Amino acid sequence: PPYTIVYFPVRGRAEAMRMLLADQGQSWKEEVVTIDTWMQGLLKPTCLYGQLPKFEDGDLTLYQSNAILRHLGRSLGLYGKNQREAAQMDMVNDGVEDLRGKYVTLIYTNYENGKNDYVKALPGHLKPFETLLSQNQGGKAFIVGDQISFADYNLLDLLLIHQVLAPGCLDNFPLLSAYVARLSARPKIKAFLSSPEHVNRPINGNGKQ
């Protein structure tokens, strides 16, 4: 620490980490980078992969949203209780990422003409998480194990935005629905989800959700 997040004025791939930091009683600084400033091309060249978010943890500067989540999961004891849970947690996050990737594609390059096919294919992409929950304490705990982890925050964020994209998409997935309500009920997460910093911040950057 301290923690500094450099990203555009949206939730996107920074919202899950923000949620994680809040739930963990952590404080951080927001360095907002507007699209206009970005289009000037000054900062972009200084970014490892030419993209944001960029994270700062003390003398450590990081890029890649999932590397950041994993770094927090590890430095905050949110990566399972043994090596086996760490692997399962990675397997879950990689899955959350694959779906997030498809989400972004739809939102930014084919919303109007691709939304119907997306929502149609959505159940097939959600079932895997529903299945995982059913095999872990009847879905009464977390995605992996009985302790929250970095994967939970990413999964939760993705589920929350899909409910915005497609209301009722979790109606046929009771475990996922209860899971979302449960983790959302966590006091520090509930406070974050209703905080002005979050609400006043759009999900994406093209005004679509």
Give the contact letters, 59-78, x = binds to ligand GTX (CB under 6 A), - = no. Answer: -----xxx------------
Q: Is the peptide bond before 2 cis (omega within 30 degrees of 0)?
A: yes
Whole-number minimum distance, CB 137 to ligand GTX, in Å? 26
Whole-number minimum distance, CB 94 to a copy of itself, in Å? 4
Is residue 60 marked as binding?
A: no
Rounded distance, CA 24 to CA 188, Å? Answer: 8
Is residue 7 marked as binding?
A: yes
Maximum C-alpha span of the chain = 52
- Residue 88 interface partner, choices ligand GTX, a copy of itself, none, CB cut-off 5-8 Å depending on type: a copy of itself
Could you give the angle at the alpha carbon of 117 between the alpha carbons of 111 and 158, nearest 5°?
65
Instruction: Please choose, from the candidates 161, 174, 49, 52, the residue with its C-alpha nearest in 3D space to the C-alpha of residue 107.
Output: 161
Rounded distance, CA 139 to CA 162, Å? Answer: 20
Is residue 44 marked as binding?
A: yes
Residue 128 binds a copy of itself, judged by CB under 8 A? yes
Whole-number minimum distance, CB 183 to ligand GTX, in Å? 22
Interface with a copy of itself (CB under 8 A), residue total: 30
Distance set, CA 118 to CA 97, 112, 123, 162, 167 (Å): 16, 11, 9, 11, 13
- Residue 13 interface partner, choices ligand GTX, a copy of itself, none, CB cut-off 5-8 Å depending on type: ligand GTX
Question: By the 8 A CB rule, do 92 and 78 touch?
Answer: no
Residue 124 binds a copy of itself, judged by CB under 8 A? yes
Rounded distance, CA 28 to CA 31, Å? Answer: 10
Whole-number minimum distance, CB 208 to a copy of itself, in Å? 23
Scan residues 30-49 and list those touching a copy of itself (CB under 8 A): 48-49
Binding site for a copy of itself (CB under 8 A): 48-50, 60, 62-68, 70-71, 74-75, 83-84, 86-88, 90-91, 93-95, 98, 124, 128, 131-132
